[PDB]
Design a protein around this ligand. Structure first.
Ligand SMILES: CSC[S@](=O)C[C@H](CO)NC(=O)/C=C/c1c(C)[nH]c(=O)[nH]c1=O
Ligand SMILES: [Cl-]
Ligand SMILES: [Cl-]
Ligand SMILES: [Cl-]
Ligand SMILES: [Cl-]
Ligand SMILES: [K+]
Ligand SMILES: [Mg+2]
Ligand SMILES: [Mg+2]
Ligand SMILES: [Mg+2]
Ligand SMILES: [Mg+2]
Ligand SMILES: [Mg+2]
Ligand SMILES: [Mg+2]
Ligand SMILES: [Mg+2]
Ligand SMILES: [Mg+2]
Ligand SMILES: [Mg+2]
Ligand SMILES: [Mg+2]
Ligand SMILES: [Mg+2]
Ligand SMILES: [Mg+2]
Ligand SMILES: [Mg+2]
Ligand SMILES: [Mg+2]
Ligand SMILES: [Mg+2]
Ligand SMILES: [Mg+2]
Ligand SMILES: [Mg+2]
Ligand SMILES: [Mg+2]
Ligand SMILES: [Mg+2]
Ligand SMILES: [Mg+2]
Ligand SMILES: [Mg+2]
Ligand SMILES: [Mg+2]
Ligand SMILES: [Mg+2]
Ligand SMILES: [Mg+2]
Ligand SMILES: [Mg+2]
Ligand SMILES: [Mg+2]
Ligand SMILES: [Mg+2]
Ligand SMILES: [Mg+2]
Ligand SMILES: [Mg+2]
Ligand SMILES: [Mg+2]
Ligand SMILES: [Mg+2]
Ligand SMILES: [Mg+2]
Ligand SMILES: [Mg+2]
Ligand SMILES: [Mg+2]
Ligand SMILES: [Mg+2]
Ligand SMILES: [Mg+2]
Ligand SMILES: [Mg+2]
Ligand SMILES: [Mg+2]
Ligand SMILES: [Mg+2]
Ligand SMILES: [Mg+2]
Ligand SMILES: [Mg+2]
Ligand SMILES: [Mg+2]
Ligand SMILES: [Mg+2]
Ligand SMILES: [Mg+2]
Ligand SMILES: [Mg+2]
Ligand SMILES: [Mg+2]
Ligand SMILES: [Mg+2]
Ligand SMILES: [Mg+2]
Ligand SMILES: [Mg+2]
Ligand SMILES: [Mg+2]
Ligand SMILES: [Mg+2]
Ligand SMILES: [Mg+2]
Ligand SMILES: [Mg+2]
Ligand code: NA
Ligand code: NA
Ligand code: NA
Ligand code: NA
Ligand code: NA
Ligand code: NA
Ligand code: NA
Ligand code: NA
Ligand code: NA
Ligand code: NA
Ligand code: NA
Ligand code: NA
Ligand code: NA
Ligand code: NA
Ligand code: NA
Ligand code: NA
Ligand code: NA
Ligand code: NA
Ligand code: NA
Ligand code: NA
Ligand code: NA
Ligand code: NA
Ligand code: NA
Ligand code: NA
Ligand code: NA
Ligand code: NA
Ligand SMILES: [Sr+2]
Ligand SMILES: [Sr+2]
Ligand SMILES: [Sr+2]
Ligand SMILES: [Sr+2]
Ligand SMILES: [Sr+2]
Ligand SMILES: [Sr+2]
Ligand SMILES: [Sr+2]
Ligand SMILES: [Sr+2]
Ligand SMILES: [Sr+2]
Ligand SMILES: [Sr+2]
Ligand SMILES: [Sr+2]
Ligand SMILES: [Sr+2]
Ligand SMILES: [Sr+2]
Ligand SMILES: [Sr+2]
Ligand SMILES: [Sr+2]
Ligand SMILES: [Sr+2]
Ligand SMILES: [Sr+2]
Ligand SMILES: [Sr+2]
Ligand SMILES: [Sr+2]
Ligand SMILES: [Sr+2]
Ligand SMILES: [Sr+2]
Ligand SMILES: [Sr+2]
Ligand SMILES: [Sr+2]
Ligand SMILES: [Sr+2]
Ligand SMILES: [Sr+2]
Ligand SMILES: [Sr+2]
Ligand SMILES: [Sr+2]
Ligand SMILES: [Sr+2]
Ligand SMILES: [Sr+2]
Ligand SMILES: [Sr+2]
Ligand SMILES: [Sr+2]
Ligand SMILES: [Sr+2]
Ligand SMILES: [Sr+2]
Ligand SMILES: [Sr+2]
Ligand SMILES: [Sr+2]
Ligand SMILES: [Sr+2]
Ligand SMILES: [Sr+2]
Ligand SMILES: [Sr+2]
Ligand SMILES: [Sr+2]
Ligand SMILES: [Sr+2]
Ligand SMILES: [Sr+2]
Ligand SMILES: [Sr+2]
Ligand SMILES: [Sr+2]
Ligand SMILES: [Sr+2]
Ligand SMILES: [Sr+2]
Ligand SMILES: [Sr+2]
Ligand SMILES: [Sr+2]
Ligand SMILES: [Sr+2]
Ligand SMILES: [Sr+2]
Ligand SMILES: [Sr+2]
Ligand SMILES: [Sr+2]
Ligand SMILES: [Sr+2]
Ligand SMILES: [Sr+2]
Length: 237
RNA sequence: UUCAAGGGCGGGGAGCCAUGUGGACACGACCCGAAUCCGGACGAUCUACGCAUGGACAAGAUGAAGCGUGCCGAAAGGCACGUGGAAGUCUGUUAGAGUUGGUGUCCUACAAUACCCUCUCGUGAUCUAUGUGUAGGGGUGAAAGGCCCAUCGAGUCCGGCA
RNA sequence: UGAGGCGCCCAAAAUGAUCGGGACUCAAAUCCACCACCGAGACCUGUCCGUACCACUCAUACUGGUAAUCGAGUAGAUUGGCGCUCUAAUUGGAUGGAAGUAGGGGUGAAAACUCCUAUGGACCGAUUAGUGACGAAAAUCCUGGCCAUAGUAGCAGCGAUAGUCGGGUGAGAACCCCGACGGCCUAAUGGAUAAGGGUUCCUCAGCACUGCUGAUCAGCUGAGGGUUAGCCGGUCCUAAGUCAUACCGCAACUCGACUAUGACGAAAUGGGAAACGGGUUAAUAUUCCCGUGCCACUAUGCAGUGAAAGUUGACGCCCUGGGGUCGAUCACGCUGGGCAUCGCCCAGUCGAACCGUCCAACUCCGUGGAAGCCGUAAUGGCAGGAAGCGGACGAACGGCGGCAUAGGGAAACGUGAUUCAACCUGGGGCCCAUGAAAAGACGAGCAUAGUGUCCGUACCGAGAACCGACACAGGUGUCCAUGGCGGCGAAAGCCAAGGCCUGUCGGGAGCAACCAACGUUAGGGAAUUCGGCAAGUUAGUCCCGUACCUUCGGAAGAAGGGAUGCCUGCUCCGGAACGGAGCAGGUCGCAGUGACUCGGAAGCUCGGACUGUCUAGUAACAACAUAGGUGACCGCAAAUCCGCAAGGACUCGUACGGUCACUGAAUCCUGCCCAGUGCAGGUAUCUGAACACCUCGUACAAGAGGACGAAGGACCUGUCAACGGCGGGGGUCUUAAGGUAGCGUAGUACCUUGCCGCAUCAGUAGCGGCUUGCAUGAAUGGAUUAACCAGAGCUUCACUGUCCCAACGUUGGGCCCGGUGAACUGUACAUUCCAGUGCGGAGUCUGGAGACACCCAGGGGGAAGCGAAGACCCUAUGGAGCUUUACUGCAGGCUGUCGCUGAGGACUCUCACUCCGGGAGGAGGACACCGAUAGCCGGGCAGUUUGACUGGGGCGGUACGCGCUCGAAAAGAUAUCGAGCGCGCCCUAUGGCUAUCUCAGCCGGGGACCCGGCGAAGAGUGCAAGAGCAAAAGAUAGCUUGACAGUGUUCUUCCCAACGAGGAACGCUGACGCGAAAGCGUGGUCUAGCGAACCAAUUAGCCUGCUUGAUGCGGGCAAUUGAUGACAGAAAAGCUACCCUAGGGAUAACAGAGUCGUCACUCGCAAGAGCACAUAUCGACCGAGUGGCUUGCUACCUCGAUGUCGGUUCCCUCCAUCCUGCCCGUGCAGAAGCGGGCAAGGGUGAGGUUGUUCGCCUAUUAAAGGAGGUCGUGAGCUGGGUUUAGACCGUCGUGAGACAGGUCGGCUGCUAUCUACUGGGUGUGUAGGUGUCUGACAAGAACGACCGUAUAGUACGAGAGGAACUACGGUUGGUGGCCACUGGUGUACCGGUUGUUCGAGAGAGCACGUGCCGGGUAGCCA
């Protein structure tokens, strides 16, 4: 047949790329020499096109003006700290080691100095549970217990924008505007609604997948559609 | 070949070459005739979708939240009037976009998709110009096997090829 | 009373009857005899030719001879000859005229040869041997040329109907120019431009070309000329993004991703230093010239030490205040014009950049001191300091002054105001959406001077300059969005400025038919139709008023009702408007939203929630999307995806994420099933590859086996909002469960027009209910639902030419004339008609009939008309797209192993390598990544296959390999999807021999046993059938292994007649068994029980392997076993309605033709009953027929096409008669029924469901008959059904997909040549004229039917009931004609009146061929 939509994606053509030339900044933690002698002042709160959440512009002591992944409760004028000796206050960044157990953090680094990888979406937060000399245990938004190098930096507090998901889009037009700010092809035509040549589920008088939807992990691209390697399906049992 | 026998093939000198001609096989194989398949190229001046930078939307209707005033209330609030001006909101041949019916006109046409009346949309998932990107078993597709320069259930050109 | 001959009745069909026709009756019939004739290419006969044979001969050269026993021919075989080109040898012709061509003479059976004459003006032969791009009637053959078509179609149709009278120029004027009059265009038909074009621009001179006619004209032809820039674009900047170089990949590159660098990337329309006004030319113009001004850089001078922080460039959508120019309008003045019953109407009244100055808003400061005040259109503001007062900063493309005794104007050369586009500046609101960047500029003075180069510059910008082959009704961006009236308006309509008469052929006919657009139609009012399709109705604004239902938004403009102008004088709101809302009085019309503009309304049901999307070019929908619901994967060194790789999208993203899927708003809900399939997890044991390891084997190696065992599978578990499933049976069974809530005859229900009800005169429709559901049912989502809809169906009110039933009118065509001027199509002939025949669907054949030639107009019956090598169907060892547990492979994923890879069946470490980090360093780590290989998964991808037979194909079946009987016609051979029926083995005895013996069955004596008798065979002999067999071929007993090895002959397979395996009969040789021996035994009495090559295993001996020997392991001769049943041998599944090609009437669908079982109709016989009575009437059985209306059968015609059903319109016919006329019978009193006969003149109608045909139903009727004409009628109409592509449901299928099952949508080309006919002409014939006739023939339905009255309340009859003859009056259908009457029309005409323009008035134009309304003459009509 013809390559399915999931295969057109990988080519990274315009239709599938994110509007990067419109994105603001890479909200990675600042790189400090050591000591924590780095402080800045929240100079402004801005909208972040790539995450539908707010971001804060900070002016650091040494003269660096950088956008920051802002937690909830940060406002203009407030002073933020980034370093091993930073104060344990919402909005400050420091290694997990320096963080008191039982404190919600966000923008947690995967590997020390990478800039942050976990808990960066609207209103989410990781939960630092255990400390140690070799391993800091964090509970991520998905609820999974993650073991991290205690040298991994994080920001105290939860991410700004919480509850963004509580309000329904109501209209296709609203979904539309948001989708235009992402790297996604939208709207979505059902596989069952296409011709056999276009999808494993296409074809047949009435619409229906002429096959079970749970597909093997080993399936090749073009065939791996439907419920990928499902451990189970439905709501029952 | 055969204990044995019986079979098979060959045996008392005619061939070799040349020229014409009958016929066979591979090759285009008496000549034309068709839908393919493959290779390398050329096309996004059409069109599909995305992106960049610009542009367009008379007038009218309806009257959301919010706010106000008055009365009622212990309060919560309620009611009335006003204000306000929301909306993939209504009417609209505004610009602009489209095309339900006439199965009208035309059907060697004005036109290889046109004409007229009726009809639908017209502040938005809107329409539109230019630039720009995606290329052939590949694009693009709110999916009709639609569209990729009058051609697409696999473009076009030349070649494979007689 | 029997028999025979001829005839009669039985006896009905569709355009015109037939024996070929005429026509025939003591025959021109039939039968019995006879007589004489005609009539082939036969037969006889003369001459000649060919061929064969004979004699003579070198001869196949002559000559002679023979043919009763020779003379036709498609495919094909054989052989002699004609012509063409060039070569060679030999030999000729030609300027005293070659070849060729044209006409003509001669020869040859013919191919073809030759001569004469004319033309021509230079080459041309013959013989012989060669050479070959050597011969055309044909291929929808190719190219060129040409005729008919035809002086034909077009030069009309579009909301842009456009001209006319004079004159000018010229050889020539409808369309070239001037004037007048008349018109057209207003977001365009005007002005400026982008792309694109490229000289189209201007001038002069032209008209052969181009131009829908003409042309003096031009976008055409000839010749010249024309585009002038510091300040308008380019140039500069960067955008999405592109390229180049470096680096890396790649076999490689002109290929490819990242990362660096550099460059490229915006001409209307992104950012951006600076120019305005006027004048000038045939054509340029912010470019030239005049005046005035400005910017940048540089130099000099003065000033200045500031200089980079900040600001700007620089920004979304929606609402809105304020400032404010142009425009427009109002008031008054000035200048000029127009009009002249008034006193009005029009135009103008100007003046830039720039320099200078003014500042509202915003922000902030001082003062002040609000505890309730300040403020807005609105929000709002304040002791964190309100108002008020003062102040800093601070705007216009704006005001003001200069510019300006610049410019411009004939002149005047204004002044104020309102509403205010541009432009300036604020306030508010929205985002799961956040609305560029960079160069540059400001920051940062002034004088004077110098420099400011390079490229573009014309013109069109479109119903003739662009793209569409065109001077194409198409397509094509920007701005002019503020000209006047109008009105809500950037709407309509009318009119300016400006443009045009080129959406470019004209002339003529009261101008016919017919067609395209359109106006008006009495009464009825959807009767029309599949369907109100088409048309119409309603309409603007204000007031009153407004249901069910509802998600409380809506429904809603629901519905329904009323008002509407003008004039006079006023009130209210507001600062006011040339803004708005009202009042009082007066008054006109048919009509006051007067034209124009401008909704018809209501209810029920189905679907999809909604806005949105889509098949460019037959589908706009119920399909796609959607928010909402849900499930799946993934912690980021991730999941998913692209790349061979280098690398990459997602991703400046991180679970409130984003990937993969399903369902499809809300609301109420979403049951049972984990057996199969899918996914996932687990797994003692089982199974499970390669490397390494072990055993055997090999001096080694091949190889055989073993141990170990990953993923995977077995096995267990989880999982259905995972594929899917939820039946039959009984009061469980398959295969897990056995259908719960709901809904239900459904867009799903075959039966089916289900049944009841509603509604209608009548309702296959629709709605409600019932419901056992052929075959509903829960995210394959169920139910339900307000709102929405060019979605499907139904009903009602209103309205109407849809209809009854048509008419009249308008505009453009049509017709005639001038000019211009195609195409389609053409084997030939062609004046046809009725029958027949023929490959069964004829203008051309046969027989008749008719027919004087030509032309004009017409509507289209026929030419199975033209257009397209049928899209249907089948066939082909065709193609393609699609599917899958088809065949075979390939990517990809998982997994083991080896290399990378290091040190000390579980472990530590660091040093390769990986990742994080700017770095130090951290994390990990011999793993991972990568290379190689092995096992598993693997329609994600590729190549293929998927057979044949067949009363078409499919399904079914196998007549696909074998044996028997019959078919089979007495040798042999012989078909069908012919009839009956078998074989794919079985048997160590059920084989072989020998000995002894005789069987079924019946009878007699003591179903077992014993004895006797009869008994040619009916028994038995493995299994079909047919055949064979009795001291046996059977039975019993005993013995035995011949069911043996080798090798042939022959026949069969395969008649004749070639073909393999297989088989049989008969031999020779060897070895045996039994018998006294002859002899028997090559399996079972005979005919079925079967399998190639390649390969393997096996048996015995031998041959052989690359210089040589040995060993291993191979190659071969002969043969046995292993299978191909599609059985003389491929390894092999489907869909296509998205389809494509080659062909086929070799094969189907409709139709024709044949048949006539079926169907319709009739007849013979007459049982039976009809109270008695066969026959008033009904009528079984059985028998005999006719038709060609039903159906089936066949495959004869057609696949280079003969368009389906139904309807409609229009014409002809048949009779088997429904009515009407005339009769006969009756179980006929009458009236009326019932049955029958003659008879085809006429009639046979309107409606409800349904596409229907049919049929059911309703009211009428004399009756409301049936059938043929290609199931008459699409070059006539329709397009509802059927029958393409889109989509849904039920059922089927793993799936693609399928289903005379249902459902919504879905294209109808052509200018008539011939013929035919309706009408109209011109000629010829009869044979200069006028007028009047005849009547062969021809057409008619010209008339059909009914009601009523008198007869008569009579005849008849107890009564009830109730006729006729005849004479009358009227109605209806049909027919022909006419307009006094009634009615319609009446774009003659007269009137009323709305908007607008001409100043008013008067009088007029436009508002589509009347703006609208009223009346209406002639004429035409019903
Ligand atoms: C020129 S061919 C005309 S068609 O054959 C006309 C005939 C009329 O009987 N129609 C049919 O035969 C229709 C057959 C159909 C069949 C077999 N199957 C279907 O599903 N639908 C049909 O219409
Ligand atoms: Cl989202
Ligand atoms: Cl000859
Ligand atoms: Cl320019
Ligand atoms: Cl304001
Ligand atoms: K055919
Ligand atoms: Mg970041
Ligand atoms: Mg996008
Ligand atoms: Mg979807
Ligand atoms: Mg589809
Ligand atoms: Mg597929
Ligand atoms: Mg383009
Ligand atoms: Mg209001
Ligand atoms: Mg574009
Ligand atoms: Mg010679
Ligand atoms: Mg020739
Ligand atoms: Mg003609
Ligand atoms: Mg001239
Ligand atoms: Mg000019
Ligand atoms: Mg024109
Ligand atoms: Mg009427
Ligand atoms: Mg009818
Ligand atoms: Mg209509
Ligand atoms: Mg007032
Ligand atoms: Mg229905
Ligand atoms: Mg919809
Ligand atoms: Mg279409
Ligand atoms: Mg539509
Ligand atoms: Mg969803
Ligand atoms: Mg769906
Ligand atoms: Mg849907
Ligand atoms: Mg019903
Ligand atoms: Mg369920
Ligand atoms: Mg579904
Ligand atoms: Mg064909
Ligand atoms: Mg087909
Ligand atoms: Mg194929
Ligand atoms: Mg890295
Ligand atoms: Mg395939
Ligand atoms: Mg092949
Ligand atoms: Mg076949
Ligand atoms: Mg015989
Ligand atoms: Mg084989
Ligand atoms: Mg063997
Ligand atoms: Mg065979
Ligand atoms: Mg074909
Ligand atoms: Mg034939
Ligand atoms: Mg046939
Ligand atoms: Mg035809
Ligand atoms: Mg009769
Ligand atoms: Mg009687
Ligand atoms: Mg008649
Ligand atoms: Mg017919
Ligand atoms: Mg016809
Ligand atoms: Mg037709
Ligand atoms: Mg026609
Ligand atoms: Mg229909
Ligand atoms: Mg489809
Ligand atoms: Mg069908
Ligand atoms: Na092929
Ligand atoms: Na393009
Ligand atoms: Na309100
Ligand atoms: Na339309
Ligand atoms: Na292709
Ligand atoms: Na012959
Ligand atoms: Na031709
Ligand atoms: Na000024
Ligand atoms: Na003209
Ligand atoms: Na809309
Ligand atoms: Na299961
Ligand atoms: Na079901
Ligand atoms: Na809609
Ligand atoms: Na009419
Ligand atoms: Na005709
Ligand atoms: Na195909
Ligand atoms: Na086959
Ligand atoms: Na059959
Ligand atoms: Na044999
Ligand atoms: Na018959
Ligand atoms: Na009659
Ligand atoms: Na009917
Ligand atoms: Na026909
Ligand atoms: Na018809
Ligand atoms: Na038609
Ligand atoms: Na028809
Ligand atoms: Sr990052
Ligand atoms: Sr980083
Ligand atoms: Sr499917
Ligand atoms: Sr469940
Ligand atoms: Sr483009
Ligand atoms: Sr709207
Ligand atoms: Sr239509
Ligand atoms: Sr119409
Ligand atoms: Sr057309
Ligand atoms: Sr509208
Ligand atoms: Sr195309
Ligand atoms: Sr070729
Ligand atoms: Sr002969
Ligand atoms: Sr002969
Ligand atoms: Sr030739
Ligand atoms: Sr001609
Ligand atoms: Sr005209
Ligand atoms: Sr036209
Ligand atoms: Sr001339
Ligand atoms: Sr010109
Ligand atoms: Sr550039
Ligand atoms: Sr610009
Ligand atoms: Sr204003
Ligand atoms: Sr110009
Ligand atoms: Sr222009
Ligand atoms: Sr145009
Ligand atoms: Sr004018
Ligand atoms: Sr002209
Ligand atoms: Sr009239
Ligand atoms: Sr009707
Ligand atoms: Sr009707
Ligand atoms: Sr359409
Ligand atoms: Sr729902
Ligand atoms: Sr399972
Ligand atoms: Sr039930
Ligand atoms: Sr005609
Ligand atoms: Sr058949
Ligand atoms: Sr025998
Ligand atoms: Sr199947
Ligand atoms: Sr289909
Ligand atoms: Sr034909
Ligand atoms: Sr008769
Ligand atoms: Sr009668
Ligand atoms: Sr019929
Ligand atoms: Sr019926
Ligand atoms: Sr039907
Ligand atoms: Sr169907
Ligand atoms: Sr239809
Ligand atoms: Sr004569
Ligand atoms: Sr009477
Ligand atoms: Sr009486
Ligand atoms: Sr008029
Ligand atoms: Sr009106």
């Amino acid at each position: 047949g013809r390559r399915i939509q999931g295969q057109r994606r990988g080519r990274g053509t315009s239709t599938f790329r994110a509007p990067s030339h419109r994105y603001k900044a890479d909200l990675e933690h600042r790189k400090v020499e050591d000591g924590d002698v780095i402080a800045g002042t929240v100079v402004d709160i801005e909208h972040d096109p790539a995450r539908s959440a707010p971001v804060a512009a900070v002016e650091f002591e040494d003269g660096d003006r950088r956008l920051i992944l802002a937690p909830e409760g940060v406002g203009v004028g407030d002073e933020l700290q980034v370093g091993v000796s930073a104060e344990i206050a919402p909005g400050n960044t420091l290694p997990l080691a320096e963080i008191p157990e039982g404190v919600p953090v966000c923008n947690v680094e995967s590997s020390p100095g990478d800039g942050g990888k976990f808990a960066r979406a609207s209103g989410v937060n990781a939960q630092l549970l255990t400390h140690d000399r070799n391993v800091a245990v964090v509970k991520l938004p998905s609820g999974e217990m993650k073991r991290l190098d205690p040298q991994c930096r994080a920001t105290i507090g939860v991410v700004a924008g919480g509850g963004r998901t509580d309000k329904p889009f109501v209209k296709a037009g609203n979904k539309h505007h948001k989708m235009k700010a992402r790297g996604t092809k939208w709207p979505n035509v059902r596989g069952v609604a296409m011709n056999a040549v276009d999808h494993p589920f296409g074809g047949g008088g009435r619409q229906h997948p002429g096959k079970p939807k749970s597909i093997s992990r080993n399936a090749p691209p073009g065939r791996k559609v439907g419920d990928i390697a499902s451990k189970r399906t439905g709501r029952g049992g």
